[PDB]
Amino acid sequence: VNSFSGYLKLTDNVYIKNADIVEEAKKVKPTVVVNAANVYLKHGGGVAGALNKATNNAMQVESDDYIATNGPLKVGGSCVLSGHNLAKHCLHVVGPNVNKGEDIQLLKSAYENFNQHEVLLAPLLSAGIFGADPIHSLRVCVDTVRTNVYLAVFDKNLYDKLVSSFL
Ligand SMILES: O=C(O)c1ccc2c(c1)CCO2
């Protein structure tokens, strides 16, 4: 049994809810929240900008030190950093950004990072300002992630479409 509430069950291991991932993280304090990161961990807008704002910029400060030491992530890659006031840990995962021309096949590699964590609160990778089709992102998630994932879809309209169209 876990703390996650109000989710629709899609599969054995994937659950979905219309929710602000920031508000959900603040309520649950999950072991792992996933960030929709870029390779530079520049948390400007989208899920990343919202998570970082909720940490009062401490996520960005920590991320800048990580990059100064390690250099940029790979598209499809990840790193584990603090969850600050939102979670124990933040798994920063880089999905391909279609608005930069990145290979959508890297979306499966991105989701494979989730399998290193038993339970996660996450957004749909490469959705929103990363430009991918969220229906496709949900299909890749279900077909890739084997650990227990609780997905947070910001838009109510999109949430309803993801559920209605789910095979
Ligand atoms: O899920 C998203 O795409 C998303 C993007 C931006 C944003 C949020 C979610 C919360 C407030 O700011």
Coordinates of C-alpha atoms and ligand atoms in Angstrom, one line a residue:
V1 CA 0.0 0.0 0.0
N2 CA 1.2 3.6 -0.7
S3 CA 0.0 7.3 -0.2
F4 CA -1.0 8.0 -3.8
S5 CA -4.8 8.9 -4.0
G6 CA -7.4 9.4 -6.8
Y7 CA -5.4 7.7 -9.5
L8 CA -7.0 5.7 -12.4
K9 CA -5.2 2.4 -12.8
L10 CA -4.2 1.9 -16.5
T11 CA -2.1 -1.3 -16.1
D12 CA -0.6 -3.6 -13.4
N13 CA 2.0 -0.8 -12.7
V14 CA 0.9 2.5 -14.3
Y15 CA -1.5 4.9 -12.7
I16 CA -2.7 8.4 -13.9
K17 CA -4.3 11.4 -12.4
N18 CA -5.2 15.0 -13.5
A19 CA -2.9 16.9 -11.1
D20 CA -0.3 19.5 -10.7
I21 CA 2.9 17.5 -10.1
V22 CA 4.2 20.3 -7.8
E23 CA 1.0 20.1 -5.6
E24 CA 1.1 16.3 -5.7
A25 CA 4.7 16.1 -4.6
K26 CA 4.1 18.6 -1.8
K27 CA 1.1 16.4 -0.5
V28 CA 2.7 12.9 -1.0
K29 CA 6.4 13.6 -0.4
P30 CA 7.2 10.6 -2.7
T31 CA 10.6 8.8 -2.5
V32 CA 11.1 9.9 -6.2
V33 CA 9.7 12.8 -8.2
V34 CA 10.7 12.8 -11.9
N35 CA 11.7 16.1 -13.5
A36 CA 11.3 16.8 -17.2
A37 CA 14.9 18.0 -17.5
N38 CA 17.1 19.1 -20.3
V39 CA 20.8 18.1 -20.7
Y40 CA 22.0 21.4 -19.0
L41 CA 19.6 21.0 -16.1
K42 CA 18.4 24.6 -16.9
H43 CA 14.9 24.5 -15.2
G44 CA 13.3 27.5 -17.0
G45 CA 9.9 26.5 -18.0
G46 CA 7.5 23.7 -18.0
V47 CA 7.5 20.9 -15.4
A48 CA 11.1 21.8 -14.6
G49 CA 10.5 25.5 -14.2
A50 CA 7.5 24.7 -11.9
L51 CA 9.4 22.2 -9.8
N52 CA 12.4 24.5 -9.4
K53 CA 10.2 27.5 -8.5
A54 CA 8.5 25.3 -5.8
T55 CA 12.1 24.7 -4.3
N56 CA 12.8 28.5 -4.2
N57 CA 15.5 27.9 -6.8
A58 CA 17.4 25.4 -4.6
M59 CA 17.0 22.8 -7.4
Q60 CA 18.7 25.1 -9.9
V61 CA 21.6 25.9 -7.5
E62 CA 22.2 22.2 -6.9
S63 CA 21.9 21.5 -10.6
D64 CA 24.4 24.1 -11.6
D65 CA 27.0 22.5 -9.2
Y66 CA 26.2 19.1 -10.8
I67 CA 26.8 20.4 -14.3
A68 CA 29.9 22.2 -13.3
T69 CA 31.4 18.9 -12.0
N70 CA 30.0 16.4 -14.4
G71 CA 29.0 18.2 -17.6
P72 CA 25.7 17.8 -19.4
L73 CA 23.5 14.8 -19.4
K74 CA 22.7 12.7 -22.5
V75 CA 19.4 12.9 -24.2
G76 CA 17.7 9.8 -22.9
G77 CA 19.8 9.9 -19.7
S78 CA 19.2 10.9 -16.1
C79 CA 20.7 11.8 -12.8
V80 CA 19.5 11.5 -9.2
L81 CA 19.6 14.7 -7.1
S82 CA 17.9 16.0 -4.0
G83 CA 14.1 16.3 -4.0
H84 CA 14.4 19.3 -1.7
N85 CA 11.0 20.1 -0.1
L86 CA 9.1 18.0 -2.7
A87 CA 10.4 14.4 -2.4
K88 CA 13.4 12.5 -1.0
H89 CA 15.0 12.4 -4.5
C90 CA 14.5 14.1 -7.9
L91 CA 15.2 11.9 -10.9
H92 CA 16.1 14.4 -13.6
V93 CA 15.3 12.6 -16.9
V94 CA 16.0 14.0 -20.3
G95 CA 13.4 13.1 -22.9
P96 CA 14.0 14.1 -26.5
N97 CA 12.8 17.7 -27.3
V98 CA 11.0 17.6 -30.7
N99 CA 11.3 21.4 -30.8
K100 CA 15.1 20.8 -31.0
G101 CA 14.8 18.0 -33.6
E102 CA 15.9 15.1 -31.2
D103 CA 15.2 11.4 -32.1
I104 CA 11.8 10.4 -30.6
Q105 CA 13.2 6.8 -30.4
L106 CA 15.2 8.2 -27.4
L107 CA 11.9 8.4 -25.5
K108 CA 12.1 4.7 -24.7
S109 CA 15.7 5.1 -23.4
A110 CA 14.4 8.0 -21.2
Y111 CA 11.7 5.9 -19.7
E112 CA 14.1 3.1 -19.0
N113 CA 15.6 5.2 -16.2
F114 CA 12.4 4.8 -14.3
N115 CA 13.1 1.1 -13.9
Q116 CA 15.9 1.9 -11.4
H117 CA 13.3 3.1 -8.9
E118 CA 10.5 1.0 -7.3
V119 CA 7.9 3.8 -7.2
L120 CA 7.9 7.2 -8.9
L121 CA 5.7 10.3 -9.3
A122 CA 6.3 11.5 -12.8
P123 CA 5.1 13.6 -15.8
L124 CA 4.7 12.3 -19.3
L125 CA 8.2 12.5 -20.8
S126 CA 8.7 14.7 -23.9
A127 CA 5.1 16.1 -23.5
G128 CA 4.2 19.7 -23.0
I129 CA 6.9 22.1 -24.3
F130 CA 9.1 19.2 -25.3
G131 CA 6.8 18.8 -28.3
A132 CA 6.0 15.1 -28.5
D133 CA 2.5 13.6 -28.7
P134 CA 1.4 12.8 -25.1
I135 CA -0.6 9.8 -26.3
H136 CA 2.6 8.4 -27.7
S137 CA 4.5 9.2 -24.5
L138 CA 1.9 7.3 -22.4
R139 CA 2.2 4.3 -24.8
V140 CA 6.0 4.2 -24.5
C141 CA 5.7 4.6 -20.7
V142 CA 3.3 1.6 -20.4
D143 CA 5.4 -0.5 -22.7
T144 CA 8.8 0.4 -21.0
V145 CA 8.4 1.1 -17.3
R146 CA 8.0 -2.1 -15.2
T147 CA 8.2 -0.3 -11.8
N148 CA 5.2 1.5 -10.3
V149 CA 4.7 4.9 -11.8
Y150 CA 2.1 7.5 -10.8
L151 CA 1.6 9.9 -13.7
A152 CA 0.6 13.6 -13.3
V153 CA -1.1 15.2 -16.4
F154 CA -1.4 19.0 -16.0
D155 CA -4.3 19.6 -18.4
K156 CA -7.7 18.2 -17.6
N157 CA -8.6 18.2 -21.3
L158 CA -5.4 16.1 -22.1
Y159 CA -6.0 13.8 -19.1
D160 CA -9.5 13.0 -20.4
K161 CA -8.1 12.4 -23.9
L162 CA -5.3 10.1 -22.6
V163 CA -7.8 8.0 -20.6
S164 CA -10.4 7.8 -23.3
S165 CA -7.9 6.8 -26.0
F166 CA -5.9 4.3 -23.9
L167 CA -5.6 0.8 -25.4
Ligands
LIG1 O1 2.9 19.2 -17.1 C1 3.3 20.2 -17.7 O2 3.5 20.2 -18.9 C2 3.4 21.5 -16.8 C3 4.1 22.6 -17.4 C4 4.2 23.7 -16.7 C5 3.7 23.9 -15.4 C6 3.1 22.8 -14.8 C7 2.9 21.6 -15.5 C8 2.7 23.3 -13.5 C9 2.8 24.8 -13.6 O3 3.7 25.1 -14.6

